[PDB]
TrEMBL record:
Coiled coil: none annotated. One of its GO terms (biological process) is maltose transport. The keyword Transport applies. This is Maltodextrin-binding protein. Keywords: Cell membrane, Lipoprotein, Membrane, Signal, Sugar transport, Transport. Its main location: membrane.
Length: 381
């Protein structure tokens, strides 16, 4: 049997899948090892490997945002990768430690990301100076009965709403000597309730649709109906191909200070179930070379956390990229400790309850954290 590797890439039916297909094709051309690039939705890949991995049907290389890395490692999904110091030295510090857990490196980075204010230059000449101005802009221009919006975003999704919580001094996990305590969830603190109250206002006063999803936000912006969204670098190519003259700015200052968004790092990881860890790691290196990631940026629009590429004027001074870099500079990497794998469902459920007017900020957050704590007592080895 000739050598074959399997790779799971995001199922975007577009730029990300095509770019990975290209470079895998070049690896096969060079090495003779056949590589199949299979589209699997990025946020479904970990759950799919949870089943297919032990079943012996999993991919050799997988990819998802770094926040669930600790969870993945604890569950035995991934193995550390063996690369030279020279290969490591080519990538940004923040990205490399985000893919590092328990002193071990679990991947090589493809993209570093933060949401920012993405606006339609034909609808919005100048960005609002403050969050208060931004919210008033939404309150005046969000008219769902005529398919028109001033500001639209996934306000039912904690990934996006995080800056509202951070503004009030809320944290996902408390500052117990860095991050050395599984029981330091801060998502039902008084400050966190202040953040969730801000979320509530977007549905009660800015009349944002209930049960929002990426497709709804993106589709409406692409149709020219929305002046501004809070979204990430992943949506740029799609917006530009929909004829939008896109501007990117850091989120307007909230309570007088810089907005603190999450920073995401997406890397390639090596499955613990891989029958060919040597060859797969070689493919991972090939897919994340300077040449590979420079091409990836050109096609996908996703910012590669490669040291030389981040300072490439072609990428660094790109007006679209610049806005995202600015916002990311004020942001924090998502937690990547194992207990992050218990956070997302309850907290997003809490956003849903408040958005629907079913539970208050306080009640929703209290219920969510109780659920989180209970689930942590069913985790690990
Ligand atoms: O079109 C959007 C999205 O739609 C589908 O996603 C579903 C998913 O299939 C459901 O299982 C559930 O998701 C779970 C996740 O599975 C779980 O990991 C966690 O998710 C959190 C992430 O781990 C965390 O990093 C963060 O996510 C960011 C992400 O870092 C950003 O890069 C950006 O993601 C883009 C995706 O990479 C891209 O594949 C696509 O996503 C699809 C998804 O593939 C598909 O299966 O587009 C997005 C950009 O629109 O944004 C996300 C945040 O939206 O935060 C999430 C928590 O939101 O928890 C969720 C919920 O329990 O629900 C999602 C839809 O929300």
């Amino acid at each position: 049997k000739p050598d074959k590797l399997v790779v799971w890439e995001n199922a975007d039916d577009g730029v990300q899948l095509n770019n990975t297909k290209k470079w895998a094709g070049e690896f096969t051309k060079k090495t003779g090892i056949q590589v199949e690039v299979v589209p699997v939705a990025l946020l479904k890949q970990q759950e799919k490997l949870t089943l297919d991995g032990p079943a012996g049907k999993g991919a050799d290389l997988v990819t998802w945002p770094h926040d669930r890395l600790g969870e993945a490692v604890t569950k035995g999904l991934l193995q550390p990768i063996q690369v030279d110091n020279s290969v490591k030295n080519q990538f940004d510090d923040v990205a490399m430690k985000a893919l590092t857990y328990g002193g071990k490196l679990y991947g090589l980075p493809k993209a570093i990301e933060s949401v920012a204010l993405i606006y339609n230059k034909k609808l919005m000449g100048q960005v609002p100076a403050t969050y208060d101005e931004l919210f008033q802009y939404a309150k005046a221009n969000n008219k769902p009965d005529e398919q028109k919006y001033g500001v639209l975003f996934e306000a039912n999704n904690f990934y996006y709403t995080y800056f509202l919580f951070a503004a009030k001094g809320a944290a996902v996990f408390k500052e117990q000597d860095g991050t050395l305590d599984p029981n330091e969830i801060g998502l039902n603190s008084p400050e966190a309730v202040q953040g969730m109250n801000e979320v509530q206002k977007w549905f009660t006063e800015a009349r944002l649709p209930q049960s929002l999803k990426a497709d709804t936000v993106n589709g409406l912006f692409k149709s020219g109906k929305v002046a501004a969204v809070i979204n990430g670098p992943w949506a740029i190519k799609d917006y530009q191909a929909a004829g939008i003259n896109v501007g990117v700015a850091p989120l307007p200052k909230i309570d007088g200070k810089d907005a603190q968004t999450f920073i995401g790092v997406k890397g390639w990881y090596l499955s613990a179930y891989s029958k060919y860890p040597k060859y797969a790691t070689e493919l991972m290196q090939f897919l994340t070379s300077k040449e590979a990631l420079a091409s990836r940026f050109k096609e996908t629009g996703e910012i590669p956390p490669q040291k030389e590429l981040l300072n490439d004027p072609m990428i660094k001074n790109n007006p679209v990229v610049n806005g995202f870099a600015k916002q990311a500079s004020k942001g924090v990497p998502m937690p990547s400790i194992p207990e992050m794998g218990v956070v997302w469902e309850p907290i997003n459920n809490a956003h849903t309850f408040v958005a629907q007017g079913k539970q208050t900020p306080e009640q929703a957050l209290n219920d969510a954290v109780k659920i989180m704590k209970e689930k942590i007592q069913t985790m690990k080895q």
